Amino acid sequence: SAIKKIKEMFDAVMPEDFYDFWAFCEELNPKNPEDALMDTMGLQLVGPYDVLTGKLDGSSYHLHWRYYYDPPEFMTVIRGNEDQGFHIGYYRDEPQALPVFVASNKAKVSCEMSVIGENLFSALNTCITENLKKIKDKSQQSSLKKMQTSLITKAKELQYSLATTTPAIKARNKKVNSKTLHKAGIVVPVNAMDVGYRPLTVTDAELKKMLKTITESENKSAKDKASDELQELLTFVQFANDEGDYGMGLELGLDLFCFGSKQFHNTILQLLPLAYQLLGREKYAKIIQEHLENRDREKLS
């Protein structure tokens, strides 16, 4: 019941910890399981969790709670500080496949992704531990230190790891071709002849200086040269695409997306839609097309 409507609206299969985490929250706040973490740490379950609540019941739902710097692989499930744009979501290399780990992002700070666990129990344990080190009252150490005890004990009965990193995550990081500007990483197939990925001709630091000059610099000389250096990269990507190294177009597309400048929107759908479809990741091609279609938004709907 809950399963078929999540694949009805969000076209994706959720892990076991997704459903177990809602049960854990329902034992905390039975009326409003979504707001079980609200008074304690100020987080609310959203995204595919809104199917379990019923605020949206009666295509366009992937974008619902998709922040500015959320790549197609990222799907938000918990929202937080609205000044920082803090939120937690599942990172998923392949749309068919299950999420590889849980990650958080501060959309109003940078595009960088922070891996906080393999499941949402470890994700919450990481958030609790970080919050406990910051100065607070005696009662707010009391109120949240009880939730850590509750979180710990339910994680073990259900037998979920609470570590920040797990062997599977480390094994996945071995297969990453590039960290990307968001630092979460990209994984594409690479055959025996080492075909599939191709690194960028420029490093990440050099690349940001190239994009900065294009968007914010007053030297028609320097900005045209940097713009021409971007064309060389774009021209290298289609040589790679012709030869099968699809991963480079995926890296550079995500790097432009990570920079945040809306000047590169047209250039991003030059890269990522074509990349995701050559990689056999059709849905992620449709994600990015709609996200840049309307990127500045009231994430509620």
Side-chain angles (χ1 to χ4, degrees):
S1 323
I3 300 71
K4 334 322 161 273
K5 23 192 194 160
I6 289 178
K7 341 312 198 195
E8 178 214 356
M9 327 190 38
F10 283 89
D11 190 14
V13 182
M14 288 322 155
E16 218 38 59
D17 71 278
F18 171 83
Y19 300 108
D20 303 325
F21 192 70
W22 172 282
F24 169 59
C25 296
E26 194 178 332
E27 320 184 331
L28 294 168
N29 191 14
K31 262 87 65 170
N32 297 330
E34 44 273 45
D35 309 329
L37 317 171
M38 201 169 69
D39 291 323
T40 326
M41 297 183 279
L43 312 183
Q44 185 187 35
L45 275 56
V46 291
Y49 275 116
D50 287 341
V51 175
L52 303 192
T53 72
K55 30 178 72 165
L56 55 64
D57 46 359
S59 61
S60 59
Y61 320 98
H62 266 117
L63 273 42
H64 158 239
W65 288 118
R66 164 160 320 261
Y67 281 72
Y68 192 84
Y69 288 115
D70 288 1
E73 292 81 355
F74 191 87
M75 183 193 301
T76 308
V77 297
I78 293 169
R79 94 169 141 101
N81 192 307
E82 321 186 9
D83 299 8
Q84 313 167 155
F86 182 78
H87 56 294
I88 279 164
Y90 283 121
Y91 199 86
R92 191 194 296 263
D93 286 321
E94 290 173 318
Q96 189 26 275
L98 290 186
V100 290
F101 48 70
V102 183
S104 64
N105 173 65
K106 296 173 165 192
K108 305 189 182 67
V109 177
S110 70
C111 72
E112 278 177 24
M113 224 84 57
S114 296
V115 183
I116 54 178
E118 200 166 60
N119 49 77
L120 293 174
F121 293 88
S122 47
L124 204 69
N125 185 57
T126 304
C127 289
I128 292 167
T129 303
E130 286 176 5
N131 169 333
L132 263 62
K133 254 72 181 82
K134 301 169 183 171
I135 192 170
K136 81 205 72 184
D137 301 0
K138 192 185 178 207
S139 299
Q140 296 304 102
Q141 34 178 328
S142 82
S143 53
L144 180 49
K145 144 177 74 73
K146 206 165 315 307
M147 151 89 66
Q148 179 136 49
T149 66
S150 298
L151 180 69
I152 285 166
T153 36
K154 169 57 93 183
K156 330 165 63 151
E157 329 307 309
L158 293 174
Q159 297 150 163
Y160 281 108
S161 72
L162 293 180
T164 47
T165 193
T166 62
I169 293 168
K170 294 190 175 181
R172 182 261 179 188
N173 292 358
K174 309 255 161 243
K175 307 174 266 151
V176 167
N177 318 265
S178 182
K179 291 196 170 202
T180 320
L181 287 186
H182 57 64
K183 282 150 95 178
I186 63 171
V187 178
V188 297
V190 173
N191 63 17
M193 273 150 277
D194 292 302
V195 167
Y197 172 75
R198 188 175 296 179
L200 300 173
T201 59
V202 53
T203 74
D204 288 1
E206 315 195 3
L207 178 63
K208 286 191 287 186
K209 286 148 186 166
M210 192 193 75
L211 300 175
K212 186 168 178 179
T213 307
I214 294 165
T215 61
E216 40 180 325
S217 189
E218 281 333 294
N219 198 13
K220 205 181 51 213
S221 203
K223 158 217 204 284
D224 280 27
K225 165 91 201 332
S227 184
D228 289 7
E229 285 178 338
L230 179 54
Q231 304 311 281
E232 291 267 349
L233 270 44
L234 289 171
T235 300
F236 290 142
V237 162
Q238 302 258 88
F239 283 117
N241 285 337
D242 292 349
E243 296 159 37
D245 291 347
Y246 304 141
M248 178 162 52
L250 173 77
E251 168 167 17
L252 183 82
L254 284 163
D255 283 350
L256 302 181
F257 175 84
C258 284
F259 202 70
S261 322
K262 24 198 63 161
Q263 183 177 331
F264 303 120
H265 276 209
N266 255 347
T267 318
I268 287 156
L269 298 97
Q270 279 303 64
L271 295 160
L272 292 184
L274 166 65
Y276 282 124
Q277 272 158 163
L278 295 160
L279 292 162
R281 306 199 180 150
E282 291 288 333
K283 185 35 74 190
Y284 286 168
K286 328 192 195 134
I287 303 298
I288 191 73
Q289 282 180 135
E290 319 168 31
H291 185 212
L292 306 196
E293 229 180 24
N294 192 199
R295 208 174 168 178
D296 283 330
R297 197 234 291 146
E298 322 208 51
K299 293 142 279 222
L300 51 143
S301 271

mmCIF file of all heavy atoms in Angstrom, residues 164-182:
data_model
loop_
_atom_site.group_PDB
_atom_site.id
_atom_site.type_symbol
_atom_site.label_atom_id
_atom_site.label_comp_id
_atom_site.label_asym_id
_atom_site.label_seq_id
_atom_site.Cartn_x
_atom_site.Cartn_y
_atom_site.Cartn_z
ATOM 1 N N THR A 164 29.358 6.532 10.874
ATOM 2 C CA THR A 164 29.327 7.471 9.754
ATOM 3 C C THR A 164 29.585 6.756 8.433
ATOM 4 O O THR A 164 28.901 7.011 7.435
ATOM 5 C CB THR A 164 30.355 8.586 9.956
ATOM 6 O OG1 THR A 164 31.610 8.022 10.353
ATOM 7 C CG2 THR A 164 29.887 9.562 11.023
ATOM 8 N N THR A 165 30.569 5.859 8.409
ATOM 9 C CA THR A 165 30.942 5.136 7.203
ATOM 10 C C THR A 165 30.895 3.639 7.470
ATOM 11 O O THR A 165 31.085 3.182 8.602
ATOM 12 C CB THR A 165 32.337 5.542 6.692
ATOM 13 O OG1 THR A 165 32.522 5.044 5.362
ATOM 14 C CG2 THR A 165 33.429 4.988 7.593
ATOM 15 N N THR A 166 30.616 2.880 6.419
ATOM 16 C CA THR A 166 30.480 1.439 6.459
ATOM 17 C C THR A 166 31.342 0.834 5.349
ATOM 18 O O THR A 166 31.728 1.539 4.417
ATOM 19 C CB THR A 166 29.016 1.010 6.275
ATOM 20 O OG1 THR A 166 28.550 1.435 4.989
ATOM 21 C CG2 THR A 166 28.136 1.621 7.360
ATOM 22 N N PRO A 167 31.674 -0.456 5.454
ATOM 23 C CA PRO A 167 32.448 -1.094 4.369
ATOM 24 C C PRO A 167 31.848 -0.910 2.983
ATOM 25 O O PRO A 167 32.595 -0.738 2.012
ATOM 26 C CB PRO A 167 32.463 -2.569 4.789
ATOM 27 C CG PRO A 167 32.403 -2.523 6.272
ATOM 28 C CD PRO A 167 31.514 -1.354 6.611
ATOM 29 N N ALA A 168 30.518 -0.950 2.862
ATOM 30 C CA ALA A 168 29.891 -0.753 1.557
ATOM 31 C C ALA A 168 30.167 0.645 1.014
ATOM 32 O O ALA A 168 30.410 0.814 -0.187
ATOM 33 C CB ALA A 168 28.389 -1.011 1.650
ATOM 34 N N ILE A 169 30.120 1.661 1.881
ATOM 35 C CA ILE A 169 30.424 3.022 1.446
ATOM 36 C C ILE A 169 31.871 3.121 0.980
ATOM 37 O O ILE A 169 32.163 3.719 -0.063
ATOM 38 C CB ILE A 169 30.127 4.027 2.574
ATOM 39 C CG1 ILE A 169 28.626 4.092 2.858
ATOM 40 C CG2 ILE A 169 30.662 5.408 2.219
ATOM 41 C CD1 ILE A 169 28.283 4.828 4.134
ATOM 42 N N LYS A 170 32.798 2.535 1.742
ATOM 43 C CA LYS A 170 34.200 2.556 1.343
ATOM 44 C C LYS A 170 34.410 1.800 0.039
ATOM 45 O O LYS A 170 35.178 2.241 -0.824
ATOM 46 C CB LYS A 170 35.072 1.979 2.457
ATOM 47 C CG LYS A 170 35.084 2.829 3.716
ATOM 48 C CD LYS A 170 36.135 2.358 4.703
ATOM 49 C CE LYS A 170 36.210 3.292 5.899
ATOM 50 N NZ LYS A 170 37.251 2.874 6.876
ATOM 51 N N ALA A 171 33.736 0.658 -0.125
ATOM 52 C CA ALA A 171 33.805 -0.072 -1.387
ATOM 53 C C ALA A 171 33.256 0.764 -2.536
ATOM 54 O O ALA A 171 33.807 0.751 -3.644
ATOM 55 C CB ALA A 171 33.043 -1.391 -1.274
ATOM 56 N N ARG A 172 32.166 1.497 -2.290
ATOM 57 C CA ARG A 172 31.609 2.371 -3.318
ATOM 58 C C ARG A 172 32.572 3.498 -3.670
ATOM 59 O O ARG A 172 32.702 3.867 -4.845
ATOM 60 C CB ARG A 172 30.266 2.931 -2.851
ATOM 61 C CG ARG A 172 29.556 3.823 -3.859
ATOM 62 C CD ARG A 172 29.795 5.293 -3.549
ATOM 63 N NE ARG A 172 29.141 6.174 -4.509
ATOM 64 C CZ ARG A 172 29.323 7.489 -4.556
ATOM 65 N NH1 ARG A 172 30.147 8.074 -3.697
ATOM 66 N NH2 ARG A 172 28.686 8.218 -5.462
ATOM 67 N N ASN A 173 33.250 4.061 -2.667
ATOM 68 C CA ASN A 173 34.174 5.156 -2.928
ATOM 69 C C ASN A 173 35.373 4.681 -3.747
ATOM 70 O O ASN A 173 35.996 5.485 -4.448
ATOM 71 C CB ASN A 173 34.614 5.795 -1.607
ATOM 72 C CG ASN A 173 33.479 6.534 -0.901
ATOM 73 O OD1 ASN A 173 32.357 6.617 -1.405
ATOM 74 N ND2 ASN A 173 33.769 7.061 0.284
ATOM 75 N N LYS A 174 35.719 3.389 -3.663
ATOM 76 C CA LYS A 174 36.750 2.832 -4.534
ATOM 77 C C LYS A 174 36.351 2.892 -6.002
ATOM 78 O O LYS A 174 37.223 2.972 -6.875
ATOM 79 C CB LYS A 174 37.033 1.372 -4.173
ATOM 80 C CG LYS A 174 37.327 1.025 -2.736
ATOM 81 C CD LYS A 174 38.806 0.740 -2.523
ATOM 82 C CE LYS A 174 39.188 0.841 -1.074
ATOM 83 N NZ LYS A 174 40.162 1.942 -0.931
ATOM 84 N N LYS A 175 35.053 2.869 -6.298
ATOM 85 C CA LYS A 175 34.578 2.846 -7.677
ATOM 86 C C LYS A 175 34.256 4.233 -8.208
ATOM 87 O O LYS A 175 33.876 4.368 -9.377
ATOM 88 C CB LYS A 175 33.340 1.949 -7.790
ATOM 89 C CG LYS A 175 33.547 0.555 -7.212
ATOM 90 C CD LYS A 175 32.257 -0.251 -7.213
ATOM 91 C CE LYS A 175 31.536 -0.138 -5.880
ATOM 92 N NZ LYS A 175 30.064 -0.278 -6.046
ATOM 93 N N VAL A 176 34.401 5.261 -7.374
ATOM 94 C CA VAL A 176 34.120 6.624 -7.795
ATOM 95 C C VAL A 176 35.192 7.088 -8.771
ATOM 96 O O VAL A 176 36.394 6.888 -8.550
ATOM 97 C CB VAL A 176 34.040 7.545 -6.566
ATOM 98 C CG1 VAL A 176 34.061 9.005 -6.983
ATOM 99 C CG2 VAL A 176 32.795 7.233 -5.752
ATOM 100 N N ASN A 177 34.757 7.715 -9.863
ATOM 101 C CA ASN A 177 35.677 8.235 -10.866
ATOM 102 C C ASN A 177 36.146 9.642 -10.522
ATOM 103 O O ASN A 177 37.324 9.967 -10.706
ATOM 104 C CB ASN A 177 35.017 8.228 -12.248
ATOM 105 C CG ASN A 177 34.232 6.957 -12.514
ATOM 106 O OD1 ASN A 177 34.746 6.009 -13.110
ATOM 107 N ND2 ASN A 177 32.979 6.932 -12.075
ATOM 108 N N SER A 178 35.241 10.483 -10.027
ATOM 109 C CA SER A 178 35.584 11.832 -9.606
ATOM 110 C C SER A 178 34.696 12.217 -8.433
ATOM 111 O O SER A 178 33.524 11.837 -8.382
ATOM 112 C CB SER A 178 35.421 12.836 -10.750
ATOM 113 O OG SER A 178 35.792 14.139 -10.338
ATOM 114 N N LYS A 179 35.265 12.982 -7.498
ATOM 115 C CA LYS A 179 34.506 13.419 -6.331
ATOM 116 C C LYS A 179 33.406 14.405 -6.700
ATOM 117 O O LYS A 179 32.385 14.468 -6.005
ATOM 118 C CB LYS A 179 35.443 14.031 -5.290
ATOM 119 C CG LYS A 179 36.363 13.020 -4.625
ATOM 120 C CD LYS A 179 36.988 13.583 -3.360
ATOM 121 C CE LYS A 179 37.714 12.498 -2.580
ATOM 122 N NZ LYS A 179 37.866 12.851 -1.141
ATOM 123 N N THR A 180 33.611 15.193 -7.763
ATOM 124 C CA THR A 180 32.734 16.287 -8.185
ATOM 125 C C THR A 180 32.863 17.456 -7.210
ATOM 126 O O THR A 180 33.434 17.305 -6.124
ATOM 127 C CB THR A 180 31.273 15.822 -8.312
ATOM 128 O OG1 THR A 180 31.237 14.519 -8.905
ATOM 129 C CG2 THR A 180 30.462 16.769 -9.185
ATOM 130 N N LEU A 181 32.353 18.631 -7.591
ATOM 131 C CA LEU A 181 32.429 19.793 -6.714
ATOM 132 C C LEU A 181 31.605 19.604 -5.446
ATOM 133 O O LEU A 181 31.956 20.157 -4.397
ATOM 134 C CB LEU A 181 31.971 21.046 -7.460
ATOM 135 C CG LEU A 181 32.928 21.610 -8.513
ATOM 136 C CD1 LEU A 181 32.399 22.924 -9.066
ATOM 137 C CD2 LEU A 181 34.324 21.790 -7.934
ATOM 138 N N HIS A 182 30.518 18.835 -5.514
ATOM 139 C CA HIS A 182 29.742 18.542 -4.316
ATOM 140 C C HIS A 182 30.385 17.466 -3.447
ATOM 141 O O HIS A 182 29.884 17.204 -2.347
ATOM 142 C CB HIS A 182 28.311 18.134 -4.686
ATOM 143 C CG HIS A 182 28.225 16.959 -5.610
ATOM 144 N ND1 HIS A 182 28.659 15.700 -5.259
ATOM 145 C CD2 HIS A 182 27.731 16.850 -6.866
ATOM 146 C CE1 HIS A 182 28.448 14.867 -6.262
ATOM 147 N NE2 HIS A 182 27.885 15.539 -7.249
#
